[PDB]
Amino acid sequence: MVMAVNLHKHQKNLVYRLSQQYLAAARDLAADVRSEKQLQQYYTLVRQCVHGLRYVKDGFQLTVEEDIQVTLQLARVLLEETHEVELAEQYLGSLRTRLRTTPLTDARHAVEFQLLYDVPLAKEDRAELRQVVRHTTGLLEELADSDAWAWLFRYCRIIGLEAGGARSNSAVLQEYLKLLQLVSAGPVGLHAFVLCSCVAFILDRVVELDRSLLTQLRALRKATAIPLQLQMWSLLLDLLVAIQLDENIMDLLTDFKDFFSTHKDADGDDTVVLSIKEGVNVRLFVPLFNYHDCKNILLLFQSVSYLTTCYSKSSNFSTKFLPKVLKTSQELKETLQKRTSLVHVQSIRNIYDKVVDLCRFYQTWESLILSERVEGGIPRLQYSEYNILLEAISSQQAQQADLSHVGRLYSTLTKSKDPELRLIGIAHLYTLIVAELSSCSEGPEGISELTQKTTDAWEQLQHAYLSSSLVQNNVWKCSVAILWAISRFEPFSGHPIHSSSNDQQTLYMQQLNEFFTDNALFKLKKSLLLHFLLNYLGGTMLVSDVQKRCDISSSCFQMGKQQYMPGMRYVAGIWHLMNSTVAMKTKEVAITRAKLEGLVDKMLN
Amino acid sequence: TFPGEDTRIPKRISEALSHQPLNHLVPKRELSRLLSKPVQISVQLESEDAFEEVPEELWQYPHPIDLDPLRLEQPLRFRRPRGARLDYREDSSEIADLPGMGQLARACLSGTQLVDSAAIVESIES
């Protein structure tokens, strides 16, 4: 009768242990789920787990330590794998109440953290993350600055604040600097994670990164007990800052070479466990921070950085390596065999799907730089605004373009929540408007309203730009100065804008000269369109000598053969034809005219 | 003259720019975003297992035990993963033949039916 006696006596513990087994079996099955039958089986196993936990929770009077363990596991499984967020809240709520009549301080906060972070995340609604901010402030007020839990709830707050980044940018950033100051005494690993999150948030909002934050960022990979996965992230984030500023990344590529060699074989956990105080850990699931995944994404980063030098058979890195990262990422997706939940297995697969879609985006971008159409159509990406951008560019450089459609595309993008996309949209709209004003035929009242549209456009472009990180990007700085000049002088525009006084005039002219002198002979990225527009402006505005003018107009005329820009190559050609005539270079006049003659043929058909 | 004079072809650089995409200004933002998302962050209590082991002999209990003596008829809704390439084939093994999962765990599966595909959804309207 011992069996019957054990059954009834150890029923509670036995069911608690069965539950863990169903969950193990679901974790085993997850990465192999490839069919509807398997999907049903998978969630039949986790259902079996939940009945099990519920059986323990609902049907027995538990000790407080038993109630904590089973309730947090139940809530965690329900929030992650089901739509039962109300049920999860109810169970967490019950524990919150029991925990108030006890001295179990850390447990109480652990439950609060699930209500303030994990639950509003599971609700998939930004508005739910914003009401959180009120409950966290209440908790924070009661706690001292030296308290580990003050740090965590303050991070709950920054997350709640991250929803609605309209002038919220100021608050989130003040909040990170405060948290960074609080945590710089504490655990070095928690400080590293907060730091990385802040530089990531700054990159996401494209606002300037204070020097001191980048110094602190680089100090993370110093010869330190920082978890290796956070040191890597720190290095990746440093690379991204140089790439957003269109800077040279040679040195950072060596730092990667050191890091990958100094720390080889590190085996490699996908989770970082930080001890924030006696009895409580923070766990960071970071399945991209490992040798193979970083070699793969580093290649993509390297590709984007050299993307614009795809015309040259020396730095056309992007052409050789984008098909590689595309292949590697589809392999990593197929061979994924992680023992975790199905939602976590699909989450890792979705990152590889995003890598591949960015790969295809940059491949198309490169193709449109070198030709009129992309062989095979423009691919549909999961990035819908990047689709509109690709639609716009290819439509703009068509043989017979529809500029009213190009305009509508670029306007949609001026309303984008992506601040970088906004800027790109406004910059292009501006060039369209400037071309309207330059070719106007309507008389004094028409010319005047178009003038006013152009100055509105120009101001919208300048405000967007001055409030971004791209102020420290010289490709953008040089091109904002160029776009300024093309609307304001008479060979470039037919109706140039004139202003009082201006001090704007000496600003951008200093700039244009600074860039033109240093890049004729810190020097700019070597994008053909950017040096074409620099040399053509400089050669026209700043050069006195006629033979040097010929050097520059010949250089600009040849540039238009190295990538697709027939319209630019044409206007460089008539410039060169006149320079070659005044210089009385009679052979060169002959061949320029000859080239020009076949040029207009192709353009007109 | 000069070649192309009296054609439609743009002759000023501002007019020609309206047909030239600013292809040196390359979007890079979505790059940082695919890294900045630590898949999961979570707080966990470090503490001893509060649930005692059962006698090892009781693991040999041969009969089904009813977990859920009532509740799944409020049936649970499960999360169908967005972006899942799902196929339809019954070529795979039955649920009580799946690893692993001990023998009492297999017995407690006997009689229960599978989760309906209708209960496995990407989303709700509430």
From Swiss-Prot, chain B:
It is found in: Nucleus. Signal peptide: none annotated. Plays a structural role in chromatin. Probably involved in sister chromatid cohesion, possibly by interacting with the cohesin complex. Belongs to the SCC2/Nipped-B family. This is Sister chromatid cohesion protein 2. It comes from Eremothecium gossypii (strain ATCC 10895 / CBS 109.51 / FGSC 9923 / NRRL Y-1056). The chain holds residues 3 to 130 of 1479 of the full protein.
